Amino acid sequence: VIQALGGIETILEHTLFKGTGFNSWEGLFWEKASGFEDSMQFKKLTHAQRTGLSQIPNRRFTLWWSPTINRANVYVGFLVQLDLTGIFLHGKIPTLKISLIQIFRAHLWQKIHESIVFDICQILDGELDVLQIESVTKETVHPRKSYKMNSSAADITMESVHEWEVSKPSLLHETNDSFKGLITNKMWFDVQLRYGDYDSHDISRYVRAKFLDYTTDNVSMYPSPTGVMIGIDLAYNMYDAYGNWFNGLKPLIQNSMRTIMKANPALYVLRERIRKGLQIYQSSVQEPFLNSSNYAELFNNDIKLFVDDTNVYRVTVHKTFEGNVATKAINGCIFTLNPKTGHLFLKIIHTSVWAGQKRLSQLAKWKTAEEVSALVRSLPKEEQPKQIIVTRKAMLDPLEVHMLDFPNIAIRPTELRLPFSAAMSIDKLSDVVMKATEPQMVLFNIYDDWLDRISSYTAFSRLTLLLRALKTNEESAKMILLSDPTITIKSYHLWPSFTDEQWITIESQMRDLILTEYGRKYNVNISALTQTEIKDIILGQNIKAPSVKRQKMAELEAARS
Amino acid sequence: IRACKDLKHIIYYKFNKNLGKGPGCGFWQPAWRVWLNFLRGTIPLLER
Amino acid sequence: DDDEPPLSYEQHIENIEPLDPINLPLDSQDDEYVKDWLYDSRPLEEDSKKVNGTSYKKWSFDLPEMSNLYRLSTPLRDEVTDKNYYYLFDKKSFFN
Amino acid sequence: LLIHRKGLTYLHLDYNFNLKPTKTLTTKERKKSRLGNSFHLMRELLKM
Amino acid sequence: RPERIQEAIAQDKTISVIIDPSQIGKPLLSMKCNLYIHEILSRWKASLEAYHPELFLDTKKALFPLLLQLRRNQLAPDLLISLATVLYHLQQPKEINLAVQSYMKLSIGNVAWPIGVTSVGIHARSAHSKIQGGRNAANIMIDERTRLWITSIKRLITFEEWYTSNH
Amino acid sequence: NIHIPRYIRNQPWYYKYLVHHRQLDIDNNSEPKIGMGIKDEFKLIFCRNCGEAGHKEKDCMEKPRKMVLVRATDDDWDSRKDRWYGYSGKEYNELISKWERDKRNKIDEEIELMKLELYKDSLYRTSTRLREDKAAYLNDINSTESNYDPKSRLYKTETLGAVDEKSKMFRRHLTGEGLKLNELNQFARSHAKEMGIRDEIEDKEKVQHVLVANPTKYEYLKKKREQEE
RNA sequence: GUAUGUAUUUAUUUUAGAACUAGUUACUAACAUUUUUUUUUUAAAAAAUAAUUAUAUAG
């Protein structure tokens, strides 16, 4: 049958394989685990709620053959456009609209657009020399310009010192053009995104058609007649351009387009959301996670922050007038700290955040990401981080979309389970969270006064011991801190002001509590373990990792010799 | 609609004989007749 | 555009002089009898020999005008003059 | 004027005769605002 | 024209940099804040070698519209009260942390949604239209110049923490 | 590979690994493709009044009397439905000429502002990109093969780390407090092995010898070992 | 998670007991993520094997 249909090439030109960006078709084949619906088919679940589970595989099937289903050579069909994107779907399939909305959710089309606009404008700021550009002014256009397919304005304007000797319009790669014909004072750059069908995906005809329509027509308001039009095909991973060149534009723009097309984060978030919507694996894990073998990377000179969301959406259960109970939201905190200097930016989320909305455990992810983006924007460039460690893996996807706005900040998911949720159970923190009447940022210094007598790395591991104790037993440890009434806490201060001998003894009490309770709970004694295994336990690191394997192999190699 | 589409087939291969494949037919008399005869049938229905 | 109201005839349209219609250019002597009126609105609306009146209900031509319209309308004539062409394509073969 | 007599102000009828909502509707509003076949048939004729 | 400049400098040596907290909650307060910002810039200018020297020109350029608004009494009062609270906790000797905390009140504010969030999931409801951020947002999102000078106040705060560390 | 089924690993009879599948352009699909171009080709292509031999009297395009380049058949759906085909440039030249004629027809500091610059010796829709910064993949547009990872937005430099050749993993170089943790970690492991024997079979207490289990003791012990030397 | 319903007044109308104590059952809650193949003896003995998961469900 595969020779009957013509081969994998003539099968895969129908499919959405070109937009995913796997390297080869051979990676279509994996032991794919179903994930969500596997968990959900066993639960106690309504009659109406169980037939909804069976339209999850149909959305993936409809996504995969979506160039062929949403093709352009149709018999009858009135073309409509999606809401916050620019996709024209011929008629009405309800499965395909859900798939493409899930792909382009959180306003991703417009983020891709202004991402490529700022990237072009930053390259043109970098080259106010030898192109002889006076100024590159970025235009402020209508927020619906990213997907107004009727007409468009320009969004980058190039004003020159004296004159530009400007060629006749031709494509980006036509190698022969005379610069002598025309003279302009200013030029315009414009970026057009199209989503291609199975039929209509000749991108060069698209860019020449958009240029030759929008320059001659009167609806599209351009500053000068001279400019260039840049077009990108998102469904099929292609680019081209058309318009007026001078001496120096074309080799700059073709290299700009190939590197932006390979390394834009926005287009990577698109291709990743496509791979997720099709449920296919591609391991691209260039930097290792924050495991126990990397552990001291936190204590470099460069600034970085831990973000944590576990206490952002909390509720209280209460009895209704009927039999069933209901949940009402309470105050929350976004736990962000930097481990080198102990600054603790504590975002108190009031309940006026959750005022009218619902689903409330999906929205909390986007609330944390939006608030972290506001915190990072409020910092200066020298004081913005260079790295952000996300604790839970469900906080990757909102932070990636909101940190599209800051491309120079790395994001590393952690590999070791961190106890910062137990930071709610400190009464000085819990008090300030609960008494709040207004959504606000409150600063704490979680290393109380330790950084004078105690260096920062042992202070972080001390805080690890304390928070693992308060997450493990929560009252035995809270009584271990509160043995003596003589040691108080100050007004500025979080922890009881112990001397350092007392910190040595109480850290010993904490590791005794943690390791004894662990060995009692999981029926595995601490004494027969490696020092690697205990350092693995206390930091909350997980086994089945590749790092535990390669660490044990490296220790075996080091101790066999 | 199918009538108009069928009429296109019998007009184009009288028009495009020995002159290619482009647009530019513009012999719009038969399709115009089809949609007028639709309109007189849906006058009494849409008044109702 | 979808958000543009329809422009007023009295301002934007009526003061513009019109443009050139199709108008196949006729010969001067081969198409002599039909040249001066072929492309009017109602071609002989007021010519009481060739029409009844401006009510425009009946028509009567000579022979050269009718012959000229016969030659000039070559691409849309029937050009089947014997009834034995429709041997098994007449209406009644279709009914059978 | 028919749409605005019926109480439906969040439906927008632009000058190329398309009917699209100006917000995200509730279900009560989607019940109150299902226009018939007759409205949309007259609407597509005006569009043509 | 140099006469008004000279008499204004003579008045500039007359007025003093004292933020009283009862005086915060109008033109003389704006001038006192204006002059304290100038004095912070002068204490940078005395010690330009040890810091980053590359930030100083850009800091002056980003601060210059703020200094202009404080010179002309044109700054909005809700924003100016927050700025004066930052500058008070900056002026006090030891509470350098309350300066950064009131700065976080200055830049983000007390708005529920600082930056808007749009189209969270597949399922669209009407109340999502309340989320977005054109209506009420942070002061760091009002205009792009306001972002520059609000960031520059934080930069002067970090300068002042270094200066009270060493000198 | 393990994953592919046996209905793909099998070559048919008439191809007598998996050479038979390789020819969109799979197997370099990670590299994005470009515009193929615009190619508009025209090819070349008895009656009583024409006098030519080709057609019939009903088909003659001349006017009935009393007595040629053709679109070459390309079948892309964009190419048959293209609005701009055989475009020479007449409309753009009329546009440029009209604009040239129109262009031919066409052709401060305040007191307090001067005071402040003399002292200083010199719209909620606005984006969050923060224009004055620069992305990291833009500095290497000219050469090839950028160092920016689009998944995790780190920019691999030579100062920042080094690549293991066999694992293809970028492990960062450490600086100050990372060195003072790593050399202290090795110190705690060595002090533990000399204090007991800690050979990891002897099955006794050794909870006091893991570093993270009790760090303040090891910080002060490292410190006094520095003080003694 | 919907449907659907319910709540949101100010502009003034005349004159047998008392005390102490902890867990067991049901039901509800869009509120929350510690491997595979064995063998043998009565804890010990053998054999083995491989750069890391979903924000998606409604009558």
Ligand SMILES: O=P(O)(O)O[C@H]1[C@@H](OP(=O)(O)O)[C@@H](OP(=O)(O)O)[C@@H](OP(=O)(O)O)[C@@H](OP(=O)(O)O)[C@H]1OP(=O)(O)O
């Ligand atoms: O026959 P239809 O389904 O109505 O589609 C035709 C058809 O295209 P295909 O038959 O290849 O699908 C014609 O092609 P030819 O019969 O001429 O080969 C023609 O194209 P031409 O303009 O080249 O005649 C025409 O185009 P138009 O729409 O301008 O009448 C139109 O295409 P669409 O219906 O797809 O627009």
Ligand SMILES: [Zn+2]
């Ligand atoms: Zn002929």
